[model samples]
Target: ELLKPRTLADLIRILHELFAGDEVNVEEVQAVLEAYESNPAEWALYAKFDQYRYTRNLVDQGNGKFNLMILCWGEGHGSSIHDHTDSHCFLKLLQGNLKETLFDWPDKKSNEMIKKSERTLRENQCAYINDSIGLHRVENVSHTEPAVSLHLFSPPFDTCHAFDQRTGHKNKVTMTFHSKFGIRTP
Candidate 1:
């Protein structure tokens, strides 16, 4: 269900609208969740992973200061361990399941990384992280199902500091802004 914006502008606009806010409340988040729960096709933009069927929403932008992206990934698809520089973020699971692993830097080591703990995220669950934190990874556990969640980043998600979880080594890379998701029809 790989769905992309009609254009990059459309994507940015959605992001902008989500974060363009002053104060946030549970109801606000619920509104976004309701939107995704109600409209599978519109939220499909976040799926972008073939016709696996998922959804996303730009919750509240946060006083024009934060960035929020709701992503839905089908079984076996997940995100990598990455840092977002100086930002505070929150994640909430609306449907399906995800394994979220939080990491910390080893004592006296700038290059070493390790997971301090791991947790399962499921329906109506939420978590948060701030600048003092280092890395985190989220994954869909099922190979034949789906997982969905929302990601809120203060100051917006501009870049991701990717890493190799197995080796505990940081990998340098930038997430490119694509006009469309990784799906094409031929």
Candidate 2:
């Protein structure tokens, strides 16, 4: 039996089933993600890259239990160090490469973020993080090529906080989808 998603439609279907419970089975979902080999053409409609920041295109609404997105990052663009907002976040590299830089929770006194570790995720690789693991910054560290990733977050959120690198100041922002259900968000 092929547990992996062979098409975009299959991915959505499997995700809905996986998340249709009181609790998300992280290990099972991770297995499916690890086994998935992304087909670039299947993600064309959702891979709209942005120049200044990454574009998050919604794939599944998740019935409020979870949500899936195809996040397209322009070459060298990255996300500010941020927390996961009490949700479990999983990232699967769909194309190109991405650098995941983990940072220690801000110092209560100094409010400074300290780098702890970093890794580059290549195609088909998956990573999971939660608030307990602290903050992280994700970037498409390529200069000439764009990067795409499948991101899944359980218990979707409408607002999130982004941290400043220098001061570790937390700024709340309303997150928006660049597109939803393969249609551009107006």
Candidate 3:
């Protein structure tokens, strides 16, 4: 009989098994994301809140194969419009509400962003993106309610490029984790 995940820990174990020294099965990964439900108590150790910016907490680093993180966003907090040249994955809402805004891909040295579309996601909902889709931003969307989400980045990008909304200037920024493996970094 195959093991079924009953908790986040089990889910991570299953993830490692999927990623183990081979081509990761993306469909299996997607099914896992959809099938698994979260337990707040189990997530509390890493899904921490920060007033300054959204917090990215590492769940499993996947041994440099991939990155699984839970991001905690304070009310009204949002990410800069960013490019995902390094990953092909999905983002799933774990709590509260979020809005995703998409922009047309800017040319190198370009100085403007052309807004394309926007949509809202509710708890337990997920969105998949391909690299060709280019830039996007995710915001908490509620003035009074904080939100949390989970995303996995394949091939483990250490940083990302955030663009100026108006100028479309790119600023490369390194990603840092607020927590890793149940331990706080701060």
Candidate 4:
């Protein structure tokens, strides 16, 4: 069941308010996102796809406080093990499926990360991670079907550090966007 047309904008507005504050009520945000997810028809405009890589930035609050993006994953596509730098990350699976593998850094001397747990999310499901348990990898579980997801990060980060799970080497990465304010990037 989807919200009526007016509620669609209301949802977006409500989300904006949620992100506007310094202290975010994650549970409330989750509930609201679930509402938006349940009604795909109302907010279908946000869905966008890319073939080469799974990424599309739908909104970036110019002040760097919050950002929203739709990520599209082809079969077998996934992200490297990484940690968000001082940001709270939330993900809502809008289409297809996603598999998230969580990890724990057991030691500082070595780069070996212990596998903590893994969870799969179907459409309309939401998950979150903060700096405390932020190290993880996300990938599409299906080989034949593509997955689409919405990600919201508070205090949007321009740079993220990715870990090489095999070697434990860390490298800083610059974030890129597919679109910003209706202007698509090449």
Candidate whose lDDT is highest: 2
- Of candidate 4, the 10-residue stretch with the lowest lDDT total is 1-10
Indicate which candidate wins on TM-score. 2
* Better candidate by lDDT, 1 or 3: 3
Model 3 Cα lDDT, one tens digit per residue, 52-141: 889989888886677888999999999989877658667878889899999877777667687799999888776776568778999997
lDDT (CA) for every model shown? 0.60, 0.87, 0.81, 0.73
Clashes of 3: 0
In candidate 4, position 148 carries an lDDT of 80
lDDT of 2 by residue, 1-186 (tens): 238788778877888888877898878888888788899888898898777999999988887799899999999999989888899899999999999999877875555677899999999998999899889999988989899999999989777789888888888888899999889996
lDDT at 62, model 3: 81
**Model 2 CA deviation exceeding 4 Å by range:** none
Better of 3 and 4 by lDDT: 3
- Best-to-worst lDDT order: 2, 3, 4, 1
- Per-residue lDDT, model 3, residue 56, is 86
Quote the positional error of residue 166 for candidate 3 in Å.
Answer: 1.2
lDDT of 3 at 28: 71
The window of 10 residues in a row where model 3 has the poorest summed lDDT is: 1-10
